[PDB]
Amino acid sequence: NNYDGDTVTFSPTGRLFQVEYALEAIKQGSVTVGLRSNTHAVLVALKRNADELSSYQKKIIKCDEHMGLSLAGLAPDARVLSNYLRQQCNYSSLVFNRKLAVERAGHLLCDKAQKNTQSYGGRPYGVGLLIIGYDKSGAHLLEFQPSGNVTELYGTAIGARSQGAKTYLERTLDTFIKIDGNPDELIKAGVEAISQSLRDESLTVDNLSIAIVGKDTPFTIYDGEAVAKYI
Amino acid sequence: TTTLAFKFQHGVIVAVDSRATAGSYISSLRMNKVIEINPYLLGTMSGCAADCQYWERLLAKECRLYYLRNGERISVSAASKLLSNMMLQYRGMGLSMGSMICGWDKKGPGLYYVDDNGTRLSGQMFSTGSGNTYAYGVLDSNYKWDLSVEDALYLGKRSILAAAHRDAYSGGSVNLYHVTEDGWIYHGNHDVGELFWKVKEEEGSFNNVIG
Amino acid sequence: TQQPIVTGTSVISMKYDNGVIIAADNLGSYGSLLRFNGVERLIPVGDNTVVGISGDISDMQHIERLLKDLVTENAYDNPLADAEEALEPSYIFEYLATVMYQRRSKMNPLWNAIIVAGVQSNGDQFLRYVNLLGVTYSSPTLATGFGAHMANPLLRKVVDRESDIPKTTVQVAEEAIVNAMRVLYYRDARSSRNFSLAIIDKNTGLTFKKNLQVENMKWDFAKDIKGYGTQKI
Amino acid sequence: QFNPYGDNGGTILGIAGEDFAVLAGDTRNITDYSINSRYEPKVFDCGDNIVMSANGFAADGDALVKRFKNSVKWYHFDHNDKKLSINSAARNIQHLLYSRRFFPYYVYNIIAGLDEDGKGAVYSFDPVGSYQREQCRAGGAAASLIMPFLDNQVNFKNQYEPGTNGKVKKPLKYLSVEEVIKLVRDSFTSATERHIQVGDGLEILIVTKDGVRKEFYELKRD
Amino acid sequence: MDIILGIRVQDSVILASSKAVTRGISVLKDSDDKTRQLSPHTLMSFAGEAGDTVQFAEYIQANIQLYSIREDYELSPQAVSSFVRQELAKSIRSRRPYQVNVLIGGYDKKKNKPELYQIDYLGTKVELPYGAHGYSGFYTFSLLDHHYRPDMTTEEGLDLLKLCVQELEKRMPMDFKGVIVKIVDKDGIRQVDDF
Amino acid sequence: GSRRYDSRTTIFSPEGRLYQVEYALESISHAGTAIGIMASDGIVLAAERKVTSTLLEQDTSTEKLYKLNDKIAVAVAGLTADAEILINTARIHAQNYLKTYNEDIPVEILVRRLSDIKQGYTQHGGLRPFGVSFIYAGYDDRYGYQLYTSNPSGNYTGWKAISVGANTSAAQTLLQMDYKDDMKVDDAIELALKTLSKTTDSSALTYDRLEFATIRKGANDGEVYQKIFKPQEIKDILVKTGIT
Amino acid sequence: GYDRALSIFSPDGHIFQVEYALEAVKRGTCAVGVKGKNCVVLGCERRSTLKLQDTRITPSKVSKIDSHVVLSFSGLNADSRILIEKARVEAQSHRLTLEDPVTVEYLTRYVAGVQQRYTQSGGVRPFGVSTLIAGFDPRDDEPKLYQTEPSGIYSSWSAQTIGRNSKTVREFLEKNYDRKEPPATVEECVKLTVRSLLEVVQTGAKNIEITVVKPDSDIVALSSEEINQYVTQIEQEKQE
Amino acid sequence: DRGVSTFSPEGRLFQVEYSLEAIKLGSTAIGIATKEGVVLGVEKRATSPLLESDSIEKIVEIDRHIGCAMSGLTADARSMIEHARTAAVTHNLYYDEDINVESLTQSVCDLALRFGELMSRPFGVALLIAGHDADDGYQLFHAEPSGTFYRYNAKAIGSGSEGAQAELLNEWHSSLTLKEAELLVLKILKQVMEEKLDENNAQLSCITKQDGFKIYDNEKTAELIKELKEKEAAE
Numbered sequence A: 001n002n003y004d005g006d007t008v009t010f011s012p013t014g015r016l017f018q019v020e021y022a023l024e025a026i027k028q029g030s031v032t033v034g035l036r037s038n039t040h041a042v043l044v045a046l047k048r049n050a051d052e053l054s055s056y057q058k059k060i061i062k063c064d065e066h067m068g069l070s071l072a073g074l075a076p077d078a079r080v081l082s083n084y085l086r087q088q089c090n091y092s093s094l095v096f097n098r099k100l101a102v103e104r105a106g107h108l109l110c111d112k113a114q115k116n117t118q119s120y121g122g123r124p125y126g127v128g129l130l131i132i133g134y135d136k137s138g139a140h141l142l143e144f145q146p147s148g149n150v151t152e153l154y155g156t157a158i159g160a161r162s163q164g165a166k167t168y169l170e171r172t173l174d175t176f177i178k179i180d181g182n183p184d185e186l187i188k189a190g191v192e193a194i195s196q197s198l199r200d201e202s203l204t205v206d207n208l209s210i211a212i213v214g215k216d217t218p219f220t221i222y223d224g225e226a227v228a229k230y231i
Numbered sequence B: 001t002t003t004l005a006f007k008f009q010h011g012v013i014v015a016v017d018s019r020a021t022a023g024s025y026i027s028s029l030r031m032n033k034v035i036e037i038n039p040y041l042l043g044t045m046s047g048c049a050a051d052c053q054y055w056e057r058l059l060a061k062e063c064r065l066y067y068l069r070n071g072e073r074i075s076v077s078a079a080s081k082l083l084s085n086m087m088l089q090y091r092g093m094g095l096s097m098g099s100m101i102c103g104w105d106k107k108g109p110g111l112y113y114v115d116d117n118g119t120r121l122s123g124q125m126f127s128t129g130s131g132n133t134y135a136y137g138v139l140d141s142n143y144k145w146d147l148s149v150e151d152a153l154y155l156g157k158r159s160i161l162a163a164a165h166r167d168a169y170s171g172g173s174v175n176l177y178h179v180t181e182d183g184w185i186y187h188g189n190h191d192v193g194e195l196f197w198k199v200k201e202e203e204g205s206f207n208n209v210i211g
Numbered sequence C: 001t002q003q004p005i006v007t008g009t010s011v012i013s014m015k016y017d018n019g020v021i022i023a024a025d026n027l028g029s030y031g032s033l034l035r036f037n038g039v040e041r042l043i044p045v046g047d048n049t050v051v052g053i054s055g056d057i058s059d060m061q062h063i064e065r066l067l068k069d070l071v072t073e074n075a076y077d078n079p080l081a082d083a084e085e086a087l088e089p090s091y092i093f094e095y096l097a098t099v100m101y102q103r104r105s106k107m108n109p110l111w112n113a114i115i116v117a118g119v120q121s122n123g124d125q126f127l128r129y130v131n132l133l134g135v136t137y138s139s140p141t142l143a144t145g146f147g148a149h150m151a152n153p154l155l156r157k158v159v160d161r162e163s164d165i166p167k168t169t170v171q172v173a174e175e176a177i178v179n180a181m182r183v184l185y186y187r188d189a190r191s192s193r194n195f196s197l198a199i200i201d202k203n204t205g206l207t208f209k210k211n212l213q214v215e216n217m218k219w220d221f222a223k224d225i226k227g228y229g230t231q232k233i
Numbered sequence D: 001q002f003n004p005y006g007d008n009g010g011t012i013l014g015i016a017g018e019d020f021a022v023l024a025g026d027t028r029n030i031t032d033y034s035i036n037s038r039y040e041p042k043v044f045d046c047g048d049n050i051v052m053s054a055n056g057f058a059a060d061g062d063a064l065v066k067r068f069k070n071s072v073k074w075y076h077f078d079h080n081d082k083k084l085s086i087n088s089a090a091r092n093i094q095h096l097l098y099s100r101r102f103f104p105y106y107v108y109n110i111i112a113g114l115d116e117d118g119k120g121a122v123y124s125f126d127p128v129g130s131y132q133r134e135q136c137r138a139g140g141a142a143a144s145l146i147m148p149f150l151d152n153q154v155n156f157k158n159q160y161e162p163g164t165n166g167k168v169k170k171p172l173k174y175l176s177v178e179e180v181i182k183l184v185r186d187s188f189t190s191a192t193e194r195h196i197q198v199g200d201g202l203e204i205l206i207v208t209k210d211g212v213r214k215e216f217y218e219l220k221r222d
Numbered sequence E: 001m002d003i004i005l006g007i008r009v010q011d012s013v014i015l016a017s018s019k020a021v022t023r024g025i026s027v028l029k030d031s032d033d034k035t036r037q038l039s040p041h042t043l044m045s046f047a048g049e050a051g052d053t054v055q056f057a058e059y060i061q062a063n064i065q066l067y068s069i070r071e072d073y074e075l076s077p078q079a080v081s082s083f084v085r086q087e088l089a090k091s092i093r094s095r096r097p098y099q100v101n102v103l104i105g106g107y108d109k110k111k112n113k114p115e116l117y118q119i120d121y122l123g124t125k126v127e128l129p130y131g132a133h134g135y136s137g138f139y140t141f142s143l144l145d146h147h148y149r150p151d152m153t154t155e156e157g158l159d160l161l162k163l164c165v166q167e168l169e170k171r172m173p174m175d176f177k178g179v180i181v182k183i184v185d186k187d188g189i190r191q192v193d194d195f
Numbered sequence F: 001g002s003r004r005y006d007s008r009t010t011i012f013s014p015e016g017r018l019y020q021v022e023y024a025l026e027s028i029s030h031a032g033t034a035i036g037i038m039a040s041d042g043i044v045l046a047a048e049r050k051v052t053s054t055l056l057e058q059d060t061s062t063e064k065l066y067k068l069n070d071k072i073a074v075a076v077a078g079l080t081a082d083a084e085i086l087i088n089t090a091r092i093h094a095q096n097y098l099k100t101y102n103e104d105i106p107v108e109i110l111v112r113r114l115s116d117i118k119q120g121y122t123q124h125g126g127l128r129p130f131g132v133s134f135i136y137a138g139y140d141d142r143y144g145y146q147l148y149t150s151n152p153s154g155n156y157t158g159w160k161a162i163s164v165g166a167n168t169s170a171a172q173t174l175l176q177m178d179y180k181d182d183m184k185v186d187d188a189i190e191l192a193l194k195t196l197s198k199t200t201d202s203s204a205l206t207y208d209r210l211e212f213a214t215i216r217k218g219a220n221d222g223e224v225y226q227k228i229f230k231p232q233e234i235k236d237i238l239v240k241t242g243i244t
Numbered sequence G: 001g002y003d004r005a006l007s008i009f010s011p012d013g014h015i016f017q018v019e020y021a022l023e024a025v026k027r028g029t030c031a032v033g034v035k036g037k038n039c040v041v042l043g044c045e046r047r048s049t050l051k052l053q054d055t056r057i058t059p060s061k062v063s064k065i066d067s068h069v070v071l072s073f074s075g076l077n078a079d080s081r082i083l084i085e086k087a088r089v090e091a092q093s094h095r096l097t098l099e100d101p102v103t104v105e106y107l108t109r110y111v112a113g114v115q116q117r118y119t120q121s122g123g124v125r126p127f128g129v130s131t132l133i134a135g136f137d138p139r140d141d142e143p144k145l146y147q148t149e150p151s152g153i154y155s156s157w158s159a160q161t162i163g164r165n166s167k168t169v170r171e172f173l174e175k176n177y178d179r180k181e182p183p184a185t186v187e188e189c190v191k192l193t194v195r196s197l198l199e200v201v202q203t204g205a206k207n208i209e210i211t212v213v214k215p216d217s218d219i220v221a222l223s224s225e226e227i228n229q230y231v232t233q234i235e236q237e238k239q240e
Numbered sequence H: 001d002r003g004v005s006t007f008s009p010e011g012r013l014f015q016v017e018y019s020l021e022a023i024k025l026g027s028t029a030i031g032i033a034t035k036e037g038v039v040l041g042v043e044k045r046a047t048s049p050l051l052e053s054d055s056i057e058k059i060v061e062i063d064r065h066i067g068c069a070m071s072g073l074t075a076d077a078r079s080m081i082e083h084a085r086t087a088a089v090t091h092n093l094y095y096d097e098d099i100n101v102e103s104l105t106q107s108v109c110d111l112a113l114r115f116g117e118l119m120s121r122p123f124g125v126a127l128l129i130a131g132h133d134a135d136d137g138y139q140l141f142h143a144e145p146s147g148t149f150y151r152y153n154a155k156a157i158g159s160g161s162e163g164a165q166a167e168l169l170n171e172w173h174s175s176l177t178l179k180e181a182e183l184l185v186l187k188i189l190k191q192v193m194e195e196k197l198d199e200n201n202a203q204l205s206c207i208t209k210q211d212g213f214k215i216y217d218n219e220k221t222a223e224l225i226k227e228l229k230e231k232e233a234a235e
């Protein structure tokens, strides 16, 4: 109200409204689902178009051979944050000959987003990110909020109507975690999960976007007729 | 190297050798010492190969941007000056570059000499490199404004040959160009070994050499 | 640009069937003066890596602190710091190699020659060299300074190529290293009798031996040597 | 005074075939009269069907290769996973080398692969970034020993057809990958005999449309 | 470059400057004009290190032309010479000084007088009836000391200048390829096309 | 953050005026009147000190008339402290020009430089403008005798006669009435004092409430002399013209 | 440094500071530009509220940027000096780097770019100035006349006016100026420029300034008497 | 007042949303992509008959293979065009090749959100970037001040955008020829424009693989307008 003019101002109840408004931009964004087993991690994203003449906005970005994320909210902010990850992943390789741990990648994103919430002049990031990866401690899935909060999860979803997919994964938890050494079945569970967040529209060939990373699987994105198999 | 270029009635001739040396060792038998900046602009290369390539290709970027901003081709005079100003930034830092900016613009054909010191000279005829003295000898005694395209191409070709023979650091092959108002025209790569014997027989020159 | 002041001489090392061995004497020379006799030039990093350093000691002490700080920093927000996300020899080496090359590129080098010896997570032997120029190389045997000239020839008689590594035992490798250290004591004027030896094995882990001495030395034949040519008495 | 440069010896050789290319190099690494390693790889697969070798000062060579590999990675990120063509890689490397015009990478660099028409390609660089496409190039320590041999045996220089006596040249027939590898091995065996910094081992990387293949051969260890 | 001469007569200033440009052991050009018009009634000749000469001259030219447009007024030769001197005195203590020696020949329209200023690369300014830079003065000043009068005509100034060039051509080891002569008077700047 | 307390000194009003410049001019309209009159053989500067005291040391006091160099002087209207900042900058600018070209700075060039500094404060920086209006009286060999004025907007104009400060509307009408082109300095002196005497808010115009100056070619032969009048000399010229 | 964003968008998609800068131009004295067949004429209003002015030394409304290009304006006088100075520096900088004088279109594009930069830079306000830039390109006999404004947009005009009551004089020019046959001579071009100003000016005495620019750097400013003769001839024909 | 980079309660940047309103006031610009080429057309919208309409440059060349049309505060586009031209030619310098249209568009869009308290506000202009490369063929992009860019088969921006976009919705199909696209741009421009469409107040342009980017002559466009009138009168 009087305390939402900038990010440097707490409200009387201890809230940061600019951060909460940035969080709101994620809810307006298109749905994306993340889930993993012990061998693989999968991202599934519902891409959004402007109209019938337009292309479908890309949702998934590659950060390294073993890591990547999906976005929901302001796409340019995702580009800035993914570019930062690319550099950090790359710094770890060039200097330490070491693949960047997914947990440490989350810590770096948290700290980058935090600086924008405490200083005057700047603004919080207006995007949420689901980071998947495979490192020395196996498969991983992270959820990034521009408040700075990063959370390691078995599965999750963000964006509009994401609560439906999140409930599904909460029921299916014991099943999909056990899908080891079977990438197609893990993707199926993700496609079935994101389907719980659909209304009116359904999953078409240029609508659906899928990514996967695993034990002997580099981070690869599937679009177009490559995802027709899963429709 | 040996390079030359001269204006005449039907445009400008550009001839260069193709040798590259690293001490007394011949590092390359065939190196391109001309850059096609645009269809109406050429640049010769003498001195440090890296310096010649980098800065003249950077000139081409800057000449290209000129066309986009102004909707018109850059003049030879302006192109040569951009390059001389580039040299003037790295003044005394150790660059080694000698080049002739050859082309055709609204004032007709244009030829400008430019070097690492920032020197920028307009003129009808120039020659750069370790063998420029040998080239000038043939050029000065045989040059006319009234030269035919055929005879002019031969003069530049013959002048490089003279240098390639005497100068140890010049040779390999001869690259010829002819610049007109419709643009530059490449007139091929000519091996000096074969060209020498041919010229000797046809012309009767190089009598002292046995063949 | 500097000059080295207090210096450490040869660091020698070699691979064997189950790991690596590395050794270095305990001397800190000040030109021709044998100034400091209790200097440890083998520095362990965790339980899987030993960094052996020769050259300027003040720069060695600086590097020693960088490695100590590296372990601290790796443990931060790392529940697997003593397990899957523990420091590897290849991480430690590449870090040092980055630092050395950066410093030489600023014309302010760390005046050292370093050998990183260790065993990787998968049981593979790690042995790689780096120096003040940022020059890196790996070989079944590695040595710095005088060791390169005198130790390598002896160690290469045991492991002449990659295929000799599985045939070489820890007893044979240690014996060769200890003999090399004796030869260096005979012939390197900036060496000492006292030295340290470290073994990093994929089964038995890190064994760090201190206060070792060169023994079984041959000097008796000196009594018979008289004059420099014609002198009999 | 601190000398930031050094000489790690070694010799490299790139030959461009009709539909293939090879990039060979010895595996010996040295300083002065000492051997550092008998097997220290010098030729690398950089991705996108491109092979590369930076011969001379190893520290600068490793740095350049590392930066080019990095340049390939960011080329994929920035341009929708587009393949980096051999000519594009060459021009990119020129700018990498010239970025240190006043404190050069002390290396003679060669890259090899295939052009966009499927034909064999070799590009040669000097330490400051001048480059050009070639058919044949030896670089490094024994470069002066090997190049004349390749002028004679690859481009058939000074070779004429018997009976004509200098009137008709030997025609420039293309060489197969098996024929090229023979010339490569004989080049390095000859260089090993008369050059002290050449020996120990020979590693060859062959590039075709099918991918990158490796071949290793022992050399004299003296 | 090498030889630049200047002489101030009754009603004009005459500048003579060599045509040669050498690079290595080869004379690249024998028709080079070592001068820039700073303003309609002010001419500056120059000589010094290669590249620096033209860059400095054109920089001065731009500054004076900028002043002329801003004020719609031509600076006096004295004012221009002082500006040039300051730039050179500023330059000599720079990281990389400009090694350029100049003569500034101008006609002051206010005072109706010709004026010649000699300035070296250190910023050493002197107003003279006749001047030179480098070794040129060693050969020519004895002739000028002898023959010069302040009431000389432009034609007599040119004749005395010819004698100076003839002496240079006889006693210098250096072939400077003749000179381009320019006259600065009340009507402006013009070039003597036959010399 | 800090934005909350920013007045924004460099913005347009909806009508296209610069608030601070307009309010600075309002400030200047309460300042003591300063008058400049240009004649064929010299220039006059006359100015009124604001409600003085008997205990003010007048002979060592200077609030209106300042010397920029030997050829150029200024009359001030507005904040004296603001004016001194600008005056010292102008003095330096004149010396820079003299060092560079070895000639005294032309009047307009000095005026333009100061006016450009004033302009800068109205367009960038976020600082309040200088609450000062100048009357420049000067001489050079190009245009001879010149009068200029500058105000906080950084706009300057040339004048034959002009007033700044209080009652300029009334003062300008009086000057426009009695001024003629063939006028001389002694006549201009009388006009300046008569105008002040009629426009003043004080009961009577006396020597202790005035600063006065002339720039004359009335110097021995072709040269210019600046005369800052002393208290006794102002008292004499007041009696001469018939005001006291 | 002072970084405050003064020029910003409003809910309706307007940048008020740029629009208020146009109001400053509306307040400024009228300026007019008319190009004939072989010339361009720049006319400028001088408000007669200011008498006792010294017209010798008072800043003239038309300013030479180079020997072949001129610039007049309407709006804040102090602001115009900054644009003029920048333009003059760029003109010499262009000659120095490219060895050709600027084209009129290039010079306009530069001045317009400066104005634009001041609409999206922190801590600065837009120029309260619109300019008319006229001249002839080197070795070209085609007349050039351009206009710029605070927003930074620019365009070429056969004839144009800016400043106070510009709406009225533009109305006059739109009906009087024929594109198929523009003022063939200098006289006709000046006459039309004076006529257009007489719709707005008040008195035709010292209130009208005229500057004729012809090809090959031939620029002259008409005197009071020369202009007065045009004013006399126009009204004598009008009495009919 | 309030921050320039402030979020609204709905999760949108106020300034970005307000710049979009400025673009709605701009003159109409239309782009249509086909397999024979991409056509770009614009409404010139001269404010007066004395304004020489040929000096209105709302269609612009970025490279030989990339063109660009603009709508909104067109003065803001000049620095964007300058950056695009620099990016295009610089990539040619570094990689000895043409730059991808998407990569060029991405480079332009990276400038968009570089505003705060960098430039002081977002751009008040939208761009239709049309081009061709070997990888993805003929492409049309819509670059907004939000930093977002969508690829389009056909797109209209400016004051008559939603009306034109609805028309492009019905008319566009994947088998359009270049000639058909040209007439279609002219048809829709004529529909949404206030004044009567002719060769002087409207401009056409195209990008083909062979000839590259070309702005159409007024004589060439005039014939296409006459061809349009006759075919509409044909039924």
Ligand SMILES: *[C@@](C)(CO)[C@](*)(O)[C@H](Cc1ccccc1)NC(=O)[C@H](Cc1ccc(OC)cc1)NC(=O)[C@@H](C)NC(=O)CN1CCOCC1
Binding pocket: B001, B002, B019, B020, B021, B022, B027, B028, B031, B032, B033, B045, B046, B047, B048, B049, B050, B052, B053, B096, B129, B130, B169, B170, D124, D125, D126, D130, D131, D132
């Ligand atoms: C003659 C050969 C003078 O020696 C001539 O100037 C050529 C000019 C030239 C220009 C462009 C490309 C190639 C050649 N110069 C050279 O050949 C120079 C000679 C030279 C050496 C050192 C210098 O110090 C600044 C200046 C000039 N040679 C080189 O530049 C040489 C170091 N480079 C190469 O040989 C590069 N090649 C080697 C073969 O692989 C591709 C790159």
Ligand SMILES: [Mg+2]
Binding pocket: D192, D193, D194, D195, D196, D197, D198, D199, D220, D222
């Ligand atoms: Mg050998």
